[model samples]
Target: SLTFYPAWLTVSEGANATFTCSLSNWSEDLMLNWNRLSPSNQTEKQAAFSNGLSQPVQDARFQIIQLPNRHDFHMNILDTRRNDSGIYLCGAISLHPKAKIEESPGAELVVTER
Candidate 1:
């Protein structure tokens, strides 16, 4: 099963926001990507983790944390803004044949005015 922390969260502009993602079945062969779907339903790649070659949009304020040898994937967003309000999830794929890909449960983050 896929899990995401703080199923829902709210933060003021300029404040820091954080989130967590993990899966019951994790493997080095799985590729992970963090995505954000805006209020308009537009989805964009936030970042990715795992033994893959994909990279994020390179937002300096965005940080991806992976605990050593752990299947933990989390995110921290500094100086949050109203635009940051969105639905976040970890979309995954597998490099191993017959490996089933899982859709993330996702989290809803609402950023308000400071």
Candidate 2:
């Protein structure tokens, strides 16, 4: 199963926020992706990685970091903005003989202006 840290977060605008995605009983070679659900219910892929390699995303603000030694995947949002607040999901896709995908419960992020 996929899991994320700090189920909820509140941050101020212009500041950066970090969230971690971790997997349990999962394979290391599985392809991973970080997705975001906008307040308007729009789902978009932020970033992805496979075999400890970074994948590309259209937005520069979204980043995916591969941490194989720690069994952790990190997503970071730099210079938080109000539009950046929403539901974030971490999904794992297995590339073995049987391909399957699983998504984490999700984490909620809230951004406020000073």
Candidate 3:
């Protein structure tokens, strides 16, 4: 199962917000991804994607840090803005046999004004 910590979080504007997603199941050769409910359009978009922790992302501000292990796939949002408030989801895709995406619970992030 996938577990996300701090199901709810609040941060000040310009402050960096951090959270983690943990997968208890085997993660080898699986593609990990993060999704966020877009504050602009209320649509869900991909926040981060990587095979491992030290992986590439769509934006430089969104990052994933991994140590050396089924590790905590922590997310960092640099300089949080008021529009950055929404729910973030963690998902994993296993291309084993067929491509199936497994979704976990999401974290609600609220950014306050500066």
Candidate 4:
């Protein structure tokens, strides 16, 4: 129930990049999460949005926005760094109905020198 825009992104250092996740056929009671895959392939949860509430993963470099309709989640990186380049993923979870969870196909992020 999650889809990412632009399959891939290439940006310069110190630049800003925004990634959007669109959710369809999802319940309003569910939670939406944004995750990142490190260059070494480690997955980390970046943020989660539930009921107009946004919870970030203890990092100031990441920002989350929850749409009024709750059908979209947006993650913004104001300062892009080389280490920030990785695969970004969008996820959703339904605590009810057996805790069903799903992740979208990851989108690649590439950062270059300014």
What are the root-mean-square deviations of the candidates from the true structure over C-alphas? 2.4, 2.0, 2.7, 1.7
Clashes of 3: 0
What's model 1's TM-score?
0.81
Candidate 4 lDDT over residue span 1-114, tens digit each: 688877999999998888888888667678888899876877799887777767778777787786667677677877999988889998888878678678788998899988
Compare the candidates by lDDT and give the number of the best one: 4
Candidate lDDT values, in order? 0.77, 0.81, 0.74, 0.82
For 1-114, candidate 3 gives per-residue lDDT tens digits of 787779999989999888887877655677777778664635354565456544435556777775456567777888888977889877787768887677778789999987
Q: Tell me the number of clashing residue pairs for each predicted model.
A: 0, 0, 0, 0
RMSD of 2: 2.0
Best-fitting candidate, scored by TM-score: 4
Ranking by lDDT: 4, 2, 1, 3
Ranking by TM-score: 4, 2, 1, 3
The residue-by-residue lDDT of candidate 1 on 1-114, one tens digit each, is 778788999998999898877777677777777888866876678887766343567775666677664577667888998988879887778886686657677789899987
Candidate 2 lDDT over 1-114, as tens digits, reads 888867988899988888888888556668888899876866689888776666658777777786755567778888889988889988888877887778888899999996
Candidate 3: the clashing residue pairs are none
Tell me the deviation in Å of residue 21 in model 3: 0.4
Residue runs of model 3 more than 4 Å from their true location after superposition: 38-43, 53-58
Per-candidate TM vs. native?
0.81, 0.85, 0.81, 0.86
Where does model 1 exceed 4 Å of error? 38-42, 52-54
